[PDB]
Amino acid sequence: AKHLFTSESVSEGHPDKIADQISDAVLDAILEQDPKARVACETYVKTGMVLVGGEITTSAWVDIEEITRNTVREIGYVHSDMGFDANSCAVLSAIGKQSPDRADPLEQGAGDQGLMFGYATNETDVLMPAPITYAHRLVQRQAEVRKNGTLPWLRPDAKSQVTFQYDDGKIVGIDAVVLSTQHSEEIDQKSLQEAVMEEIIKPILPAEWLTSATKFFINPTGRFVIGGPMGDCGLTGRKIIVDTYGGMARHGGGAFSGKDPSKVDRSAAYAARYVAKNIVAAGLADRCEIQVSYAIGVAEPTSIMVETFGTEKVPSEQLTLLVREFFDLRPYGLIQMLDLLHPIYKETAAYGHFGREHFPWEKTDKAQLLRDAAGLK
Amino acid sequence: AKHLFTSESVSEGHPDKIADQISDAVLDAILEQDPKARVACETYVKTGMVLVGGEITTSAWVDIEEITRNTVREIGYVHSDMGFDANSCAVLSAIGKQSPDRADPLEQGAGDQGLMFGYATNETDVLMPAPITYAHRLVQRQAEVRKNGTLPWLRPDAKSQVTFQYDDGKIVGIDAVVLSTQHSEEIDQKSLQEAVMEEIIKPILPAEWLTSATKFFINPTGRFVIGGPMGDCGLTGRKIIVDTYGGMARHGGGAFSGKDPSKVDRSAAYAARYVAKNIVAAGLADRCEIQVSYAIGVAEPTSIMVETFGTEKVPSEQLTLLVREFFDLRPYGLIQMLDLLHPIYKETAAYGHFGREHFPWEKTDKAQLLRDAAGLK
Ligand SMILES: [K+]
Ligand SMILES: [K+]
Ligand SMILES: [K+]
Ligand SMILES: [Mg+2]
Ligand SMILES: [Mg+2]
Ligand SMILES: [Mg+2]
Ligand SMILES: [Mg+2]
């Protein structure tokens, strides 16, 4: 029975995502000199300005001014007529720095409470939901084509929003595609509409899914000329859903950018993606969602629950059992089970933290061992 | 079959929530002089300072400096030894202002795309999930007792986190309670732990739910003396989940504070709470979650889906049908179906947007008419 579901994405250079990227760019830069640095760096971008403010506990010395402008230039906001320019804009900092000064490290208790949810579903090749997958690929392509000379009238900022019609649990096809891209004065809308059809939408949306019925809305308002942080206002942690699973799965509140991995808000969440993906790469279920939660100063999580929503090939009991044998979910264990203390984090900050395979939380190494330990098939 | 679930809350005066409140306090103040004002005001708070920055399109003139300090004082951060003082802290603004200058207004198309999810469940008296309900009531009580002289050693900032054990769909009871409150130098932890037990936890958590087994963690780290924005960093839109359903239900990305009601991110979301609550106040199901989505410049929503997760008392079809007859979900219709253009919004900004009955989205007026129109019982 049919039903339909939607998910959005934005590009690098939508103002919130500018903030996520600059945040994670500081965290990377600090982690490069000091992997054990504890960092929380939040950022606010508005037409003139980038305020990067945080607390950081490190020996590292880094230049927040140049880190900022280099991230703004890579996105490509480089001239006033764009909205915002990486070379003349103001960058202010309010980052306060501290220098660091149980018997088994893994048993160190969790620094801040909370809840994290992870998901995987066999709906795609990457085990992510198809919506959020396609939304990302659309915005991603957009930047590819901007960035690679094909369609050099494109400017950085853009949103995509795919809406899928299922019938139960099978993707049936694509009811609507929204895609709105910022562009120059060169081009008018009919002309933009052929290009975004040819070069962005057509090569990404799978064809059997596209129909005579697919409502497509390329630049519905027309004329998007400006432009990122001019007249809008971006801050880290705002694209929480796009960062995860486009709202196919749940979420406890937490943002990721600018959090170094001691922060469970990030790690528990990466790890939950990792547990659920391995669970389904092993055929124990088809869709799995895990909630983990932690309490301040306790190190074993206060809760684990699994929802395989009717898709099991072993009982939930056996499954919750397996979750605990194969995965060290103590805060410091996460960091080890996934080897986090590395500058891997900027590339996360646009296009989605999950479904992208080459990050340590997307690897399915535990798949087999996991099949075995209750009910090898 | 048992399983357990967790949700957190924070008080007024946790730094993010400080931001939400100041934002909504500007929006209220502007709406009081100009109900049709279009406002998006985002805020950032860090030890010295409050930066309130936005775009606003209004005739109204309001004093952002005094709006800020009055909100900071009501929360109660009033002296340096607290962390932060409403009377000496800096307030900066970067709010850019514009003055305003189809045939049927209701048919005006939606300003920005996206997705919104609303939920209700019969688990409580207010039709909200019990977790997020109790988390809120805990933090809420905390401020009540701070604010009312009972426990005047309390300071503003605090987090609660209830974890519930169900067995399927029935709340069985409460496995753990975390509660951490900022406090003065007066009091030591054993003493704080009796008071927070007597006066905060005991009078709020329902007793049959509390057991010999309930793990309680009052100030687990001990000594929380300071203090809100000192050394942490708050910005609007960060407590997205606590604002909604503590992660029992889904969420498309969007924050609410500082958004005037033309913003679907807020309105579509209030309305979805309203549709789902009426659906269950009428006994058509037990738990309902609605997704609505909108596309830029279209006015009928691009999608509606309903999940009554096996709890129906009429088919989903009949239900999706009823959703469309009883509720005007066009952006401008929402505003009318709920009468939004009123300064009601600051009180929303701490303790949760939903489950609080006296807001127009919590009222169950459509309940009956809704029962009838397919399958009066
Ligand atoms: K952050
Ligand atoms: K958020
Ligand atoms: K906002
Ligand atoms: Mg947190
Ligand atoms: Mg925004
Ligand atoms: Mg939006
Ligand atoms: Mg925070």
mmCIF file of N, CA and C in Angstrom, chain B residues 298-377:
data_model
loop_
_atom_site.group_PDB
_atom_site.id
_atom_site.type_symbol
_atom_site.label_atom_id
_atom_site.label_comp_id
_atom_site.label_asym_id
_atom_site.label_seq_id
_atom_site.Cartn_x
_atom_site.Cartn_y
_atom_site.Cartn_z
ATOM 1 N N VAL B 298 4.920 26.343 -4.430
ATOM 2 C CA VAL B 298 3.674 25.567 -4.513
ATOM 3 C C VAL B 298 2.887 25.795 -3.230
ATOM 4 N N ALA B 299 1.554 25.700 -3.166
ATOM 5 C CA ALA B 299 0.825 25.909 -1.921
ATOM 6 C C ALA B 299 0.155 24.655 -1.361
ATOM 7 N N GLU B 300 -0.421 23.769 -2.145
ATOM 8 C CA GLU B 300 -0.794 22.472 -1.623
ATOM 9 C C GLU B 300 0.520 21.750 -1.318
ATOM 10 N N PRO B 301 0.702 21.078 -0.175
ATOM 11 C CA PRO B 301 1.865 20.252 0.107
ATOM 12 C C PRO B 301 2.115 19.179 -0.914
ATOM 13 N N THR B 302 3.334 19.144 -1.383
ATOM 14 C CA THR B 302 3.826 18.030 -2.147
ATOM 15 C C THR B 302 3.596 16.644 -1.551
ATOM 16 N N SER B 303 3.443 16.414 -0.237
ATOM 17 C CA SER B 303 3.200 15.068 0.296
ATOM 18 C C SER B 303 2.497 15.160 1.655
ATOM 19 N N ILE B 304 1.724 14.100 1.903
ATOM 20 C CA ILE B 304 1.133 13.806 3.189
ATOM 21 C C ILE B 304 1.378 12.307 3.283
ATOM 22 N N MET B 305 1.824 11.815 4.444
ATOM 23 C CA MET B 305 1.714 10.395 4.742
ATOM 24 C C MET B 305 1.289 10.267 6.188
ATOM 25 N N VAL B 306 0.549 9.238 6.507
ATOM 26 C CA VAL B 306 0.167 9.002 7.869
ATOM 27 C C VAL B 306 0.819 7.692 8.348
ATOM 28 N N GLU B 307 1.392 7.596 9.564
ATOM 29 C CA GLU B 307 1.687 6.307 10.184
ATOM 30 C C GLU B 307 0.997 6.299 11.519
ATOM 31 N N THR B 308 -0.010 5.494 11.410
ATOM 32 C CA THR B 308 -0.638 4.878 12.528
ATOM 33 C C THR B 308 0.076 3.586 12.263
ATOM 34 N N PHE B 309 0.717 3.108 13.317
ATOM 35 C CA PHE B 309 1.641 1.982 13.219
ATOM 36 C C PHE B 309 0.704 0.931 13.802
ATOM 37 N N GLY B 310 -0.057 0.210 12.973
ATOM 38 C CA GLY B 310 -0.940 -0.875 13.391
ATOM 39 C C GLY B 310 -2.038 -0.507 14.374
ATOM 40 N N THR B 311 -2.341 0.759 14.601
ATOM 41 C CA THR B 311 -3.266 1.097 15.669
ATOM 42 C C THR B 311 -4.606 1.624 15.172
ATOM 43 N N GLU B 312 -4.897 1.472 13.885
ATOM 44 C CA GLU B 312 -6.017 2.124 13.236
ATOM 45 C C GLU B 312 -7.330 1.590 13.782
ATOM 46 N N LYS B 313 -8.397 2.362 13.605
ATOM 47 C CA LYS B 313 -9.758 1.886 13.754
ATOM 48 C C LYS B 313 -10.532 2.351 12.524
ATOM 49 N N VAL B 314 -9.885 2.439 11.358
ATOM 50 C CA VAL B 314 -10.400 2.782 10.027
ATOM 51 C C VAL B 314 -9.188 2.679 9.113
ATOM 52 N N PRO B 315 -9.189 2.362 7.812
ATOM 53 C CA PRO B 315 -7.970 2.223 7.037
ATOM 54 C C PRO B 315 -7.385 3.592 6.814
ATOM 55 N N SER B 316 -6.061 3.494 6.761
ATOM 56 C CA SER B 316 -5.148 4.562 6.395
ATOM 57 C C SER B 316 -5.685 5.406 5.253
ATOM 58 N N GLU B 317 -6.199 4.761 4.203
ATOM 59 C CA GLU B 317 -6.852 5.449 3.101
ATOM 60 C C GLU B 317 -7.898 6.431 3.607
ATOM 61 N N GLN B 318 -8.940 5.917 4.242
ATOM 62 C CA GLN B 318 -9.945 6.740 4.882
ATOM 63 C C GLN B 318 -9.380 7.817 5.791
ATOM 64 N N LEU B 319 -8.276 7.458 6.412
ATOM 65 C CA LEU B 319 -7.625 8.391 7.276
ATOM 66 C C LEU B 319 -6.965 9.482 6.446
ATOM 67 N N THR B 320 -6.261 9.198 5.348
ATOM 68 C CA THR B 320 -5.509 10.222 4.634
ATOM 69 C C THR B 320 -6.506 11.164 3.978
ATOM 70 N N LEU B 321 -7.626 10.576 3.513
ATOM 71 C CA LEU B 321 -8.832 11.271 3.066
ATOM 72 C C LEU B 321 -9.265 12.265 4.149
ATOM 73 N N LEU B 322 -9.667 11.808 5.343
ATOM 74 C CA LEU B 322 -10.053 12.704 6.412
ATOM 75 C C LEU B 322 -9.095 13.844 6.730
ATOM 76 N N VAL B 323 -7.765 13.583 6.683
ATOM 77 C CA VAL B 323 -6.731 14.590 6.930
ATOM 78 C C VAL B 323 -6.964 15.756 6.013
ATOM 79 N N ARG B 324 -7.162 15.471 4.725
ATOM 80 C CA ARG B 324 -7.389 16.546 3.779
ATOM 81 C C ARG B 324 -8.737 17.249 3.937
ATOM 82 N N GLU B 325 -9.852 16.601 4.288
ATOM 83 C CA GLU B 325 -11.082 17.352 4.492
ATOM 84 C C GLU B 325 -10.941 18.228 5.714
ATOM 85 N N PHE B 326 -10.416 17.796 6.866
ATOM 86 C CA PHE B 326 -10.584 18.653 8.039
ATOM 87 C C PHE B 326 -9.575 19.748 8.263
ATOM 88 N N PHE B 327 -8.508 19.741 7.458
ATOM 89 C CA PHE B 327 -7.386 20.612 7.705
ATOM 90 C C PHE B 327 -6.878 21.223 6.422
ATOM 91 N N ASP B 328 -6.775 22.548 6.561
ATOM 92 C CA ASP B 328 -6.273 23.371 5.480
ATOM 93 C C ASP B 328 -4.781 23.399 5.662
ATOM 94 N N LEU B 329 -4.088 22.598 4.877
ATOM 95 C CA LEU B 329 -2.666 22.562 5.096
ATOM 96 C C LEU B 329 -1.845 23.434 4.176
ATOM 97 N N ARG B 330 -2.480 24.334 3.427
ATOM 98 C CA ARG B 330 -1.734 25.252 2.573
ATOM 99 C C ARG B 330 -1.050 26.179 3.558
ATOM 100 N N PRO B 331 0.156 26.693 3.324
ATOM 101 C CA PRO B 331 0.843 27.589 4.220
ATOM 102 C C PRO B 331 -0.102 28.625 4.746
ATOM 103 N N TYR B 332 -0.887 29.323 3.912
ATOM 104 C CA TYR B 332 -1.634 30.386 4.547
ATOM 105 C C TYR B 332 -2.848 29.888 5.267
ATOM 106 N N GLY B 333 -3.301 28.710 4.890
ATOM 107 C CA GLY B 333 -4.414 28.098 5.575
ATOM 108 C C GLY B 333 -4.027 27.751 7.004
ATOM 109 N N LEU B 334 -2.866 27.129 7.241
ATOM 110 C CA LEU B 334 -2.336 26.815 8.560
ATOM 111 C C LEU B 334 -2.487 27.963 9.487
ATOM 112 N N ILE B 335 -2.066 29.101 8.985
ATOM 113 C CA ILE B 335 -1.996 30.266 9.815
ATOM 114 C C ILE B 335 -3.383 30.630 10.265
ATOM 115 N N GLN B 336 -4.356 30.284 9.430
ATOM 116 C CA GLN B 336 -5.739 30.576 9.722
ATOM 117 C C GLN B 336 -6.391 29.506 10.568
ATOM 118 N N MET B 337 -6.055 28.254 10.278
ATOM 119 C CA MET B 337 -6.667 27.118 10.956
ATOM 120 C C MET B 337 -6.261 27.103 12.420
ATOM 121 N N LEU B 338 -5.096 27.684 12.649
ATOM 122 C CA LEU B 338 -4.555 27.818 13.961
ATOM 123 C C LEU B 338 -4.490 29.256 14.483
ATOM 124 N N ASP B 339 -4.832 30.336 13.781
ATOM 125 C CA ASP B 339 -4.682 31.702 14.281
ATOM 126 C C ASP B 339 -3.380 32.036 15.003
ATOM 127 N N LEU B 340 -2.374 32.147 14.143
ATOM 128 C CA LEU B 340 -1.043 32.282 14.639
ATOM 129 C C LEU B 340 -0.578 33.703 14.852
ATOM 130 N N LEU B 341 -1.238 34.733 14.345
ATOM 131 C CA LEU B 341 -0.518 35.979 14.304
ATOM 132 C C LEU B 341 -0.807 36.726 15.569
ATOM 133 N N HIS B 342 -0.043 36.282 16.562
ATOM 134 C CA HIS B 342 -0.210 36.690 17.923
ATOM 135 C C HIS B 342 1.079 36.358 18.614
ATOM 136 N N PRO B 343 1.483 37.174 19.593
ATOM 137 C CA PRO B 343 2.635 36.976 20.468
ATOM 138 C C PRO B 343 2.360 35.927 21.501
ATOM 139 N N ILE B 344 2.447 34.703 21.021
ATOM 140 C CA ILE B 344 2.240 33.572 21.920
ATOM 141 C C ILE B 344 3.527 32.803 22.028
ATOM 142 N N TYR B 345 4.608 33.268 21.411
ATOM 143 C CA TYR B 345 5.656 32.361 21.045
ATOM 144 C C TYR B 345 6.777 32.245 22.047
ATOM 145 N N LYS B 346 7.052 33.223 22.925
ATOM 146 C CA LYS B 346 8.132 33.113 23.893
ATOM 147 C C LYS B 346 7.871 31.950 24.795
ATOM 148 N N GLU B 347 6.657 31.731 25.256
ATOM 149 C CA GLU B 347 6.428 30.680 26.243
ATOM 150 C C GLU B 347 6.665 29.283 25.748
ATOM 151 N N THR B 348 6.625 29.166 24.453
ATOM 152 C CA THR B 348 7.080 27.986 23.760
ATOM 153 C C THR B 348 8.574 27.573 23.924
ATOM 154 N N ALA B 349 9.417 28.561 24.206
ATOM 155 C CA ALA B 349 10.833 28.408 23.956
ATOM 156 C C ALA B 349 11.620 27.602 24.984
ATOM 157 N N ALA B 350 10.984 27.249 26.075
ATOM 158 C CA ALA B 350 11.567 26.324 27.024
ATOM 159 C C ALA B 350 10.414 25.459 27.506
ATOM 160 N N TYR B 351 10.744 24.220 27.860
ATOM 161 C CA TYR B 351 9.792 23.224 28.333
ATOM 162 C C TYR B 351 8.926 22.548 27.298
ATOM 163 N N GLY B 352 9.106 22.893 26.030
ATOM 164 C CA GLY B 352 8.466 22.097 25.000
ATOM 165 C C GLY B 352 7.265 22.794 24.372
ATOM 166 N N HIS B 353 7.281 22.626 23.057
ATOM 167 C CA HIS B 353 6.287 23.237 22.205
ATOM 168 C C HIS B 353 5.008 22.452 22.217
ATOM 169 N N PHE B 354 5.126 21.150 22.449
ATOM 170 C CA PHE B 354 3.959 20.295 22.506
ATOM 171 C C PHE B 354 3.576 19.617 23.840
ATOM 172 N N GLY B 355 2.315 19.257 23.959
ATOM 173 C CA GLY B 355 1.797 18.647 25.161
ATOM 174 C C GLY B 355 1.333 19.688 26.128
ATOM 175 N N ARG B 356 1.317 20.944 25.727
ATOM 176 C CA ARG B 356 0.971 21.978 26.666
ATOM 177 C C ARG B 356 -0.329 22.681 26.371
ATOM 178 N N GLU B 357 -1.268 21.949 25.789
ATOM 179 C CA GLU B 357 -2.708 22.179 25.921
ATOM 180 C C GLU B 357 -3.317 23.549 25.638
ATOM 181 N N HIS B 358 -2.869 24.608 26.309
ATOM 182 C CA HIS B 358 -3.315 25.952 26.022
ATOM 183 C C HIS B 358 -2.744 26.625 24.782
ATOM 184 N N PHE B 359 -1.943 25.991 23.959
ATOM 185 C CA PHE B 359 -1.526 26.601 22.709
ATOM 186 C C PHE B 359 -2.512 26.156 21.669
ATOM 187 N N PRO B 360 -2.826 26.961 20.687
ATOM 188 C CA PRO B 360 -3.755 26.628 19.649
ATOM 189 C C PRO B 360 -3.476 25.326 18.951
ATOM 190 N N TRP B 361 -2.272 24.772 18.895
ATOM 191 C CA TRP B 361 -2.086 23.499 18.177
ATOM 192 C C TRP B 361 -2.419 22.230 18.985
ATOM 193 N N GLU B 362 -2.679 22.409 20.289
ATOM 194 C CA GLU B 362 -2.937 21.341 21.232
ATOM 195 C C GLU B 362 -4.428 21.127 21.509
ATOM 196 N N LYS B 363 -5.289 21.954 20.892
ATOM 197 C CA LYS B 363 -6.716 21.943 21.163
ATOM 198 C C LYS B 363 -7.383 20.941 20.238
ATOM 199 N N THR B 364 -8.322 20.188 20.770
ATOM 200 C CA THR B 364 -8.910 19.075 20.066
ATOM 201 C C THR B 364 -10.292 19.276 19.486
ATOM 202 N N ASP B 365 -10.558 20.504 19.109
ATOM 203 C CA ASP B 365 -11.867 20.876 18.629
ATOM 204 C C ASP B 365 -12.329 20.018 17.428
ATOM 205 N N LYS B 366 -11.448 19.553 16.559
ATOM 206 C CA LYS B 366 -11.899 18.919 15.349
ATOM 207 C C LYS B 366 -12.202 17.469 15.656
ATOM 208 N N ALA B 367 -11.982 17.005 16.886
ATOM 209 C CA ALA B 367 -12.065 15.594 17.250
ATOM 210 C C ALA B 367 -13.291 14.846 16.773
ATOM 211 N N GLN B 368 -14.453 15.418 17.070
ATOM 212 C CA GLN B 368 -15.709 14.772 16.750
ATOM 213 C C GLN B 368 -16.024 14.696 15.253
ATOM 214 N N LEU B 369 -16.028 15.872 14.611
ATOM 215 C CA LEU B 369 -16.314 16.029 13.198
ATOM 216 C C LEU B 369 -15.446 15.045 12.436
ATOM 217 N N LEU B 370 -14.209 14.922 12.923
ATOM 218 C CA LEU B 370 -13.256 13.956 12.432
ATOM 219 C C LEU B 370 -13.671 12.508 12.655
ATOM 220 N N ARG B 371 -14.193 12.119 13.810
ATOM 221 C CA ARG B 371 -14.713 10.765 14.007
ATOM 222 C C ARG B 371 -15.754 10.410 12.953
ATOM 223 N N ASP B 372 -16.715 11.323 12.764
ATOM 224 C CA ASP B 372 -17.840 11.110 11.879
ATOM 225 C C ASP B 372 -17.495 10.755 10.486
ATOM 226 N N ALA B 373 -16.777 11.679 9.894
ATOM 227 C CA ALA B 373 -16.599 11.678 8.465
ATOM 228 C C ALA B 373 -15.896 10.489 7.812
ATOM 229 N N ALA B 374 -15.469 9.514 8.595
ATOM 230 C CA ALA B 374 -15.528 8.152 8.121
ATOM 231 C C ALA B 374 -15.549 7.454 9.449
ATOM 232 N N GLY B 375 -16.682 6.831 9.679
ATOM 233 C CA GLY B 375 -16.766 5.844 10.727
ATOM 234 C C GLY B 375 -16.856 6.445 12.119
ATOM 235 N N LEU B 376 -17.904 7.263 12.296
ATOM 236 C CA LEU B 376 -18.541 7.409 13.600
ATOM 237 C C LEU B 376 -18.697 6.076 14.316
ATOM 238 N N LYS B 377 -18.374 6.230 15.590
ATOM 239 C CA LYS B 377 -18.396 5.151 16.546
ATOM 240 C C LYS B 377 -19.064 5.836 17.747
#
